[PDB]
Write a protein that binds this ligand. Sequence first.
Ligand SMILES: [Mg+2]
Ligand SMILES: [Zn+2]
Ligand SMILES: [Zn+2]
Lengths: 146, 49, 83, 110, 146, 215
Amino acid sequence: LPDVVVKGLPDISRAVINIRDDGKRELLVEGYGLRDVMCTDGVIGSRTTTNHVLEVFSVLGIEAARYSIIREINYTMSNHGMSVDPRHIQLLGDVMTYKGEVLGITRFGLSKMRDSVLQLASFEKTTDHLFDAAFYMKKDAVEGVS
Amino acid sequence: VKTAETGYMSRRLMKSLEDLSCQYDNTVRTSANGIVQFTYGGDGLDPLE
Amino acid sequence: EKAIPKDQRATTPYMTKYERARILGTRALQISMNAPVFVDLEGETDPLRIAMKELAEKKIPLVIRRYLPDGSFEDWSVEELIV
Amino acid sequence: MLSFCPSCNNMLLITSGDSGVYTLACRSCPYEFPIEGIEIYDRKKLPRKEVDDVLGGGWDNVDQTKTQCPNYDTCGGESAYFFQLQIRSADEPMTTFYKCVNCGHRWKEN
Amino acid sequence: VRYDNSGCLVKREDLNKAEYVDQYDAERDFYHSLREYINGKATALANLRKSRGMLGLLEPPAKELQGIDPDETVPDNVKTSVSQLYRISEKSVRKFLEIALFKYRKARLEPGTAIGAIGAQSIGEPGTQMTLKTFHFAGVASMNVT
Amino acid sequence: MDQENERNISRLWRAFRTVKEMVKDRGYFITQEEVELPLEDFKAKYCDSMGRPQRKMMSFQANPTEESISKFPDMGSLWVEFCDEPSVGVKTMKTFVIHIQEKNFQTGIFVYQNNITPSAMKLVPSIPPATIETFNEAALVVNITHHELVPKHIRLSSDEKRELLKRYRLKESQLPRIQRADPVALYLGLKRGEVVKIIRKSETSGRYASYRICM
Ligand SMILES: [Mg+2]
Ligand SMILES: [Zn+2]
Ligand SMILES: [Zn+2]
């Protein structure tokens, strides 16, 4: 009994009121629900972003997903003094989101549209990819640098 | 720990952008001739320059 | 499979670094295969340096075939490609 | 609840008998504490969990130093928060990370 | 030219309507910024000239005596003073514009560039210099975001 | 209690405003006199005496405007309908499709309260002449189009799509894609093969346009 939720979204571990070195007391929450926080009363939904790219993608769109990707990566390397031209980050976001969904750089993500069984096997999971390609009678052309 | 952990990250990033090259019509395309960017960085400008 | 006519061309009129490197490599390979050179050597034996000299004099008899992604191509001679 | 029999000291439980009596029978031992208009209540306190004030910032307690940030043209910052780490082999010297007090721009001078 | 989305000319009232944004927009902003910089230099000279009493010719003149030089009434003193402080010759302006246009043209990305590989290494090389353990300034006491 | 009712009227008012904006920018005869509805005025027009919101007399007629009909010749009227029961049943969407077909509606907006039956997806795509778009009252409280992280998606007619595919000399497979059921694609009613112009802004490269094609 003394563990149940009566008030608030049951997605937020905790909320914490912050100050941006001014008289503005913004609050950032340690949760996994962005639409609920966006629609909560007294919160401006126009300016309300989460650092979770996949949460941005499912709520706002693939374009907002690539914006979130670019801002997150840039900020991440801006807190370590890594001066990278933003065009590289823009290209990373564009290659991550140009399929209409946020595709990772993980092995599962690489199987996006490449169809290059040689490149996939060189990357990782050689035998299963090769055998699936041989079973499916895949006809991959030789176009990639790998 | 960072050595190997970061080593794969760089290789993985390359594997994804291995065949992305600026074309002669000023578009960034995959090896499948599919468009990723209609103009590099929305500018067409080389960061090296 | 259709060459763009010379009167109009959308590609850049400037030579890229890759175009220059590949032109120098091709010309140097030709010279190393005993092709005649159209520059005054002044005692130079290296085919690569002979090719650089011809490029400086713009006397390399090669053209660059730039394929557009749609399959067409426009031809740019080494002379007309400005550096 | 957390109560035990006086005979066998085993944990007492509530069982429903005839007429639905909520007697505190002890399993494993013939012990029967019936309820005759008597209230068995177990109260345990719970924390109040008071409010928590603004997180703000405690940058006053962070080691500063006299270094001008790379973005000196935009912000004239002569000071920068620092911390030193040896993120090289033990033959290279230590690495110092900076953060301008005027703009917050971070950089590592090594 | 900024053709429409269907290939027509814009009406000069919908020039910046934001549905006709296309390529060449970065070039247009570059040209406008060049004009703004030259305008700043010219306005500085004009403010100096009008601070010397003589006419600050920010705008071209238009009158019957427009042909004559409006610096004749100046007694040869503040004229040489102004030429001492700011003296922008036409050759200087043309040289600056030549340099700026040449640099903008040279800054364009060259076709055939392995831009994807360059971006991958530009995002990955700074990634080998940062710790996987998040190291913070001692005393911030902020949330432990990775 | 009174708090639940007050929150509910405010929330459904926000949802109604978002729906009105969504049908406005999709291109239809809607203006600010019905978009910027004072919550009190909306309450004094769609909330009755004892104060319960009723969601049957806000279903309105949306008609194409002159510019929209000129650009897109095939665009009929829109029906936006709000559900009442928490769980949508077979009968309600059946009579909704009945209304669509008996009044010859090109498209229809369904905005339910809480949840939709798993059997609805087997009954909803059965409409040859029309299309059904399925929305939640809680999912459109704030329209994502007004978010700062969402660039201006601009839907292009078939003429503009053909011109774009020829200016770059492209097939449709070469364009970047945008998903069906993507939050912005659902907002604009993008159908498969509908190229949308995206006006994105960058800090270091200014305002520029990209394009995406709907699957
Ligand atoms: Mg060493
Ligand atoms: Zn006992
Ligand atoms: Zn600074």
